[PDB]
Design a protein around this ligand. Sequence first.
Ligand SMILES: Cc1cc2nc3c(=O)[nH]c(=O)nc-3n(C[C@H](O)[C@H](O)[C@H](O)COP(=O)(O)O)c2cc1C
Ligand SMILES: Cc1cc2nc3c(=O)[nH]c(=O)nc-3n(C[C@H](O)[C@H](O)[C@H](O)COP(=O)(O)O)c2cc1C
Lengths: 350, 349
Amino acid sequence: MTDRFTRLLGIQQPIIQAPMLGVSTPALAAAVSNAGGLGSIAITGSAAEKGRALIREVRGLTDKPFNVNLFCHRPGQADPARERAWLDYLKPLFAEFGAEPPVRLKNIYLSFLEDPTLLPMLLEERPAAVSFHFGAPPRDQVRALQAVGIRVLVCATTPEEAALVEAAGADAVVAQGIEAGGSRGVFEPERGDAAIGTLALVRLLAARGSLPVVAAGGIMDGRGIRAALELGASAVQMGTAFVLCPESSANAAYREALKGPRAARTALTVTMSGRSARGLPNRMFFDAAAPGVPPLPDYPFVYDATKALQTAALARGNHDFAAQWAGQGAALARELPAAELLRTLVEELR
Amino acid sequence: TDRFTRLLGIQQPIIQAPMLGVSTPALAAAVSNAGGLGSIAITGSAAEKGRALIREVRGLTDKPFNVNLFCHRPGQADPARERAWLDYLKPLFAEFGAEPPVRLKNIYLSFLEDPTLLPMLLEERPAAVSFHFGAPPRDQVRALQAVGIRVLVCATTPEEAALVEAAGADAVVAQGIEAGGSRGVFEPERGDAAIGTLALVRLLAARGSLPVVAAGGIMDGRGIRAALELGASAVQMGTAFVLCPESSANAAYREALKGPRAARTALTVTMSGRSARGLPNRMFFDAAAPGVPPLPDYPFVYDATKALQTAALARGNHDFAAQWAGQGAALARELPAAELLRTLVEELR
Ligand SMILES: Cc1cc2nc3c(=O)[nH]c(=O)nc-3n(C[C@H](O)[C@H](O)[C@H](O)COP(=O)(O)O)c2cc1C
Ligand SMILES: Cc1cc2nc3c(=O)[nH]c(=O)nc-3n(C[C@H](O)[C@H](O)[C@H](O)COP(=O)(O)O)c2cc1C
């Protein structure tokens, strides 16, 4: 299965370094691709021409295939009244840092479904792989990418979501287990979250004998990779393992957090961004259902509010509101140059 | 690795999970005779009934087997809380022409509150004694080990695993979020880390000392191989054995697990008073919803639910049943237990 997948992508090793918005960089992606895996960058939140520049930066650092990731959520629905109430609720937190909340919130992460400039840019630049999170694009768009040689991956958290990935015509499904760090790939969180663990999810999707399955969530070493392959996966995707790499853009506080005792426990929160996401809990991790908490605005408007608070806190040296995403294998994190980490994972896999 | 197999004197690193209401002496004996470790659960029975169940297993196998006991913090009776809960359930009872019970009972005595259990186990000396929801005091673990019993305790986190090591147990059963039935969380009031099997097993094997038994979501030899790659010394499988004819799952449960409902499991605290995974039905609702009163302690809640199940059953209604199943439920197979064990071994090899 790994022979099939590595051949499908242009690569030597069945290991994808996860795209991680705010953490992956062209340097990180190129290091992993150079070492033989599939490096990744995340381009959502940037204008298409900035995305183009980022893709070109990676190409200036590696000749090998890499992965470009875009969010494909339902386009956020602005709700000024609900957003106003949310900001008013956050007011005392801003005031701790001598700040006021932003006067309005913005749709800071445009979905692939709402920014028509993204697809033609990708068709021009032709990265080896394009991946989607939160949903699959229409079949005709997936086809357009494939027509110029691009391999298309989509994340799914359930067999039902995997069926939609299949119907979209993707080349592979990234099976994201509950272990995974960062945003959950749930398509329609208003319907709930089955919260299936990696070991069950990968086996269920592989037992379907359709798309190659890339296991994502909680994998930190070659033993984890071997286990994923035993379950039927064709490859793995690893985020938390690469966060401490010097090539990533994690800041010092994030690295310190992930190296220390806080790594012993991760949690899910919707109050950071408006969508369920896993990280090291802090003051942004509260109960949205608690008395006094007004209704949550839509994703990604909530994250715009949180980013403003993060900025105010950071300006006073306070890191207690940071987005420090991490999977349930966080305590097994290592700090190595990314090429060395890739090499080490391959040795462990053998 | 032969770390677990040599510890228990068995041929195969596979435990058929103890499953209160589903495992039987016949199931345990079939699995043990086939070379694995069969298990029974004896909580909810008087010690002498537990003794009888242990003797039933011995009548059917000369091989090692596992006897499981709940080790939760003893439930505290609270008549006012229980009356409020019964009142909330009242319309459900009325739907079936029944009255709710007047009082709730502590139907599942913890190992910590029934002092007749330890002496009985010391006399009967099963090969393994296992504990769910907590570890007994070190002195009691030692008492069992002193007569040659291997002691297993379930843990859902590295912090709970540390308590298992502190208690001096022989092995830790790492229960991932995939697992069917009751979650082994020691102190649910502190929250639930809800760690998946793949992370949990690796964490315990990479950072701890004890042999790790992987539990949750494992349905075939590929799953067993995956667990061993993560560093487990054995596996424990519940859902996989539910459909065996030797189990005491009723027909509705068997048909539910075989049919389309197997595509979704969920956790509920409203069935028993403790978080547990199964095929969702009318007993699966949000305990934090508007108008829902505070939950009585475990296991008093389950006594209430059993009464409702009885009433619904009398009218041919199965929508309140406890049909526990793990997240690998869609991969369940229906075979004689010894034949399933043989198949798993072939798949493992
Ligand atoms: C800090 C961080 C950032 C992430 N950013 C993205 C992202 O921008 N887009 C995306 O599709 N997935 C993102 N992910 C999720 C990964 O693709 C993958 O599901 C996850 O990293 C696997 O879990 P692991 O961290 O245990 O390896 C991110 C994960 C983390 C920890
Ligand atoms: C119907 C059912 C009943 C169970 N009963 C018990 C029990 O009585 N005592 C216990 O310690 N574990 C019990 N378990 C949990 C198992 O020990 C084990 O954690 C779980 O079955 C593993 O998940 P799996 O069903 O995916 O194999 C039960 C599980 C199920 C599905």
